[PDB]
A paper describes a structure:
The monomer of RSFP has a mixed α-β architecture. The main structural motif is an eight stranded mixed β-sheet located in the centre of the monomer. On the one side of this sheet there are two long helixes, while on the opposite side there are five helixes with additional three stranded parallel β-sheets and a complicated network of loops. The native form of this protein is a trimer that is reflected in the crystal symmetry.
Analysis of the Matthews volume for the native RSFP crystal indicates the presence of one molecule in the asymmetric unit (VM = 2.37 Da·Å−3 solvent content 48.14%). The sequence identity of the investigated protein to the search models was 47%, 46% and 49% respectively. The last one had the best statistics in the Phaser program and this solution was used for further structure refinement. In the presented crystal structures the monomer is an asymmetric unit. The trimer assembly is built on a crystallographic 63-fold axis. The structures of the apo RSFP and its complex with RB are very similar; the rmsd of the superposed monomers is 0.571 Å.
Residue numbers in the entry:
A (entry chain A), B (entry chain A), C (entry chain A): 11 to 297
The structure:
């Protein structure tokens, strides 16, 4: 079988680097439909990594419609134990600047219309999201960033990510409100991704790429002709360097994650009480 | 007809007590589908009480999928005028400890994906939820708790219950955020139950059983082998004693509730303007 | 073709004034279904205005079920460039009194179950809602209010509108929470209306009519026999005077709105990459 211990979720061409060898595609069907796009597999110095383009090829999906359950289920069928999610974010804080990266340790789920569990319809489980982003993988990302020797910006850790429904950007009042809730960065995609990955017993952490001040800072800038091209471009290229470094550390270090046994004390419906349809739907998630 | 003035909504075997006589089951169909499980009826010292197992037998439903509308409609068809809802909650406050009970007077609805009204599709009404939990029934619960002489814990009143979608437990950031909104306890089930009960003109109040500190307090405890069994067990048994006391007080005192006429000044669409399908669907709710 | 530069969204009989000539109705079909009701067109001193009864005739729709997408799409097909949305609101602030009007400059979207974009299913766009209510149209509304010489109340500007799902009114705890988020007024209808209007490149602003203190102020008053009739009546009649004044100013002044080109730098999927079904669905929104 095609198999990977590690996966990256982000934009396409995160995988488009000569360092990534024997680039190949796999179509995985799941009980939840198809993932956003064929998962790309290849090796980074002999280590197999799965890359999943969250928004599909050509960026064809809005955050609200991303098939999060199919995406996470498909990664679980490849045997993925670690996920690095890479995403563009607005800053809510003066010291978090465009081209900086942020490794949050906390999250607040403000999304509204997304299916955010694998459970229901015949099975009940309540995983803990107290620490929603694996601190072992977040600590690796910090060292990976340093190892990547990135030229512009700095990397910040121990930050709070607020996830909103989208697809519109926030009003100034909502931005002010997120600041008062002590959030630091804002995106649209890492919820319910983090909740599902937890249910799937996969360690999950985020590498956030600051792309502008959310509107708490009136600018209408870093969204220009000579800018958001270079901005997004540079973030994307820098992000690729960090991921290369992170893969090598995850491969050699293999940190134990609390996510790895998240299901075992959370499951309320014993497997022997599930219907056949339920057990089948949940098969890759179960022990 | 089978009839009850009072109903309890909670776990099964709230009704499993020798004091409850001529235990019987009734299957009630509603315009909203079936309730979570057959309603159990019996007498507590001659007084008939309906018990409804919110999560179904064997705890088979997640909070998000509980058929709240069918549950409340079915209780209304039995002529229920008072509901005591019993539910497990996390504490957001140092002085609210595991095995304590809490009688909240306020609620904040943070649920996302639940149908939370009987209205729409041919009828418009806007009930007031200013006081979402009947203070007459909440005052009875306080005296009932004292009357029950419970051995462990204490009971706290005038608290705020935040209801979240689930099924996962909160991140630490969300727990911090609920604390800043001045919530005291967190659960997943009493919304939209309280809104529907109000629309149904039934007095409704909550008895909350503290089962752990929500993650604002890092522990990984009171969820152990020698613990969450005894914890949940003891809460359940203590809860049964309080309910016995509450039923006797509600029966002898019959307090007037503002919930009893909540529909009459809230209804925008006069009954004579409703279609036949609408009037039929809403029949048990109307005057 | 039937055509209007300006539209009013509110209660019926906003248009029921002798000043409004050659009153006529148009049934507009959209890719989203039908609008809440036939749009009424007529002239205010030679200027053609579209009036759309948000809740349908006889107030038959709850806020949650209003067909916001069909409503905004239909107005866009009439060539509307400016929308004044008129809505009843609860006050969260002592200085905002019943019969006052409020022209908010900010909004916080707390609605849960409303489709709040035209995008998805084949097209991706992210408009900025930083300033969600056109300040040119809001400045006109302030001068229009003064010009209308309204007898009771005053008009307040630069306020924050929190939009909730409904249909029930807020608990006291939620009202306290909105106050702490610095919201000033509460309604149920201007989201997703404002987001859709932005996507549609139409300038949009709200005239809010204070109809009572939200429950942060315990009263059970201005909802009485000799009151909420006169209250709502007077608000409605005063609102009509302001709208007359606003139309004349919008017609002579024709302010440029940032909403007018909101789509052009927000669209991620180029038109040439859309399917035929997508381009067709979105036709009136595109360049």
């Amino acid at each position: 079988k095609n198999a990977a211990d590690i996966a990256i979720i982000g934009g396409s061409g995160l995988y488009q680097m000569q360092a990534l060898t024997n680039k190949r595609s796999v179509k995985i069907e799941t009980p939840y439909g198809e993932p956003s796009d064929d998962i790309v597999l290849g090796e980074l110095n002999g280590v197999t990594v799965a890359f999943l383009t969250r928004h599909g090829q050509g960026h064809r999906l809005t955050p609200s419609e991303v098939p999060y359950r199919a995406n996470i289920y498909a990664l679980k069928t490849l045997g993925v134990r670690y996920i690095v999610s890479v995403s563009a974010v607005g800053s809510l804080q003066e010291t978090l600047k465009p081209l900086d990266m942020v490794i949050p340790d906390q999250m607040i789920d403000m999304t509204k219309q997304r299916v955010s569990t694998f459970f229901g319809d015949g099975a009940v489980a309540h995983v803990s999201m107290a620490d929603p982003l694996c601190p072992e993988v977040a600590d690796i990302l910090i060292r990976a960033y340093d190892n990547a020797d990135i030229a512009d910006g700095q990397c910040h850790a121990k930050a709070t990510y607020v996830c909103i429904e989208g697809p519109q950007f926030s009003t100034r009042a909502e931005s002010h409100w997120y600041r008062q809730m002590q959030a630091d960065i804002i995106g649209m995609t890492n919820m319910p991704e983090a909740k599902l990955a937890r249910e799937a017993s996969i360690a999950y952490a985020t590498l956030a790429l600051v792309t502008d001040f959310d509107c708490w800072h009136p600018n209408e800038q870093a969204v220009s002709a000579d800018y958001a091209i270079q901005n997004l471009m540079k973030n994307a290229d820098n992000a690729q360097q960090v991921i290369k470094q992170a893969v090598a550390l995850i491969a050699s270090e293999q940190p134990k994650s609390i996510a790895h046994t998240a299901l075992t004390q959370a499951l309320v419906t014993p497997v022997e009480a599930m219907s056949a349809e339920t057990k089948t739907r949940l098969a890759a998630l179960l022990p």
